[PDB]
Symmetry: C2
Subunit: 333 residues, 2 copies
Amino acid sequence: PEVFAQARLRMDQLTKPPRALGYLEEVALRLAALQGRVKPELGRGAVVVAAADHGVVAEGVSAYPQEVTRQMVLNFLRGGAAINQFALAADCAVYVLDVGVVGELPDHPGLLKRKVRPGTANLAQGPAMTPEEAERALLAGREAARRAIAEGATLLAAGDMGIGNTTAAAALTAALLGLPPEAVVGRGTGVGEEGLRRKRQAVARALARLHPGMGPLEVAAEVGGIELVAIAGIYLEGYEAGLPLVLDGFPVTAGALLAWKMAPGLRDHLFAGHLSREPGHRHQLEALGLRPLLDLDLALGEGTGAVLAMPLLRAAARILHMATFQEAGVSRG
Amino acid sequence: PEVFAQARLRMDQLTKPPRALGYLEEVALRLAALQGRVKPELGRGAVVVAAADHGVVAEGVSAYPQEVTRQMVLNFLRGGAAINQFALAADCAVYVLDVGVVGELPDHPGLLKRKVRPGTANLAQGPAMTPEEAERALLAGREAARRAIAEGATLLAAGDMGIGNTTAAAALTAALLGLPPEAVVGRGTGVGEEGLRRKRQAVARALARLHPGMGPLEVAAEVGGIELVAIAGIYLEGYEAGLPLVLDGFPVTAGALLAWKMAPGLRDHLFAGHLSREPGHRHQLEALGLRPLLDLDLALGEGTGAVLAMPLLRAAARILHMATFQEAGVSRG
């Protein structure tokens, strides 16, 4: 691992005071170690937005009708969503993966139709999905990332779209980290005390069907969402492909937690794009041991926070491309 | 000002929960009001790095030889500096303006030679420069920005390069904001207690030559730096040209403070790229009433923090380009 050492040695000789580029110096080094290069290279990015509906909307956990998921997917394909706008500004390709949206979707170049089932079952009253479906969701996730990678992605983010997925995310997070509902439940798409109560209860109901020994994917099948599992697959594929992986918000990071529990060293490839407003996000980042690159009080999802951070990751990658004191003829003191 | 209202009305109808894009929503609105457009447009950016030496280096306030300024300028022209690397990643043009570097500099396409004098006089023992020189520095600053603007700049940042300029920045800041040395003095390019002491003393010496009634530029002439005044000019020109202006670190923001004191409404065009490690930076941003877009513990300058934030500003500009619920056929609840 001479590269880790060499990159670190070069960093110390770049033309700038020691520690002058703060947290970006650490990012630069991680990117260096990931690619096995002293001077990391980054270009075209990609985000795979996984969409699926949740049966838990029946418990009244969202402020939006279930139909918003399907409608937003069409919005993604037509470029009218936030993720479309940010991806345009960040040189990021946009892929949309349907793994569980309720309703049919027409064929479209930017859409991978892999519907595992019309939304999950109500997670508050039983397993969200079966083990076989969870495996298909994971497979669909890996497939989409694979395509994004084959098409030139150098940085990979995952995005989410699923009305009521903050509940599934909280349950999956509480389960994988051994946390109580109160620690992982938040505002979501904008809910008051009545909503929060109903979410905490749904999470509690799910956690009560779990037991020690259950593997991470079995836990995800019981308490999560189809798109959350697909997201875990997106990161698993990217990790195996050795690419830098960028985290978005609470629902997306919940999927990253699953991937991590299934692949221990995957955290080495993760970069937290931001810290969302969702209270549970802090817990996820603390367990992943990651510092958010951005904190803009975002609460949208879709992979927006991850995509907004891509430019920063590219800037960090360029740090080691700077001249050293000797290379630039600059006195060091 | 129907545009302010219309943009605000559209923001509320975009396809996303209310407040979902956090602080970026405010940025989007400011950008909208600045351009007088509902859907703000941004593209090519530019940063003008003003360089000049300080006579106060004689008080031993820096950990680097004075020659580093001239050497770094050559580094800028050859693309080996951090600002070169970040500008490449942010689609930002780089101009270098010599207004007070000690020593000759060869003709170069990316350099505007406008040396006001070989470095300022020791600010700790008398006026850093004369009123006439301050006016020439300001003029040089406006000239460089004008060229950057004529060449297509849609976003304008200022950068700094001047060994010992954190002392001049602190004095200029303390003077314009009525703050004590202790509040504006910090680590600089990396100094211990001995350095900090010497800086606070130099600031105190300068502040003692000032009196009520003195205009902002007269204050700058007495206690600042040639490049800091040039930076004030860069922002003044950009402001008059009606462009969005991006702030970098402590020394650059000190120049922005001068511009602001000379042009009251200029703050309407300012966007804080980041919050540097320099303690005094917080004071500057509080007085300017600006929230930092980034906080990466940066302490370099050169305009790096401002350039790193350009991509975010472009992403914020695209927010209003999103589809509204009606335009996208998405139910709002």
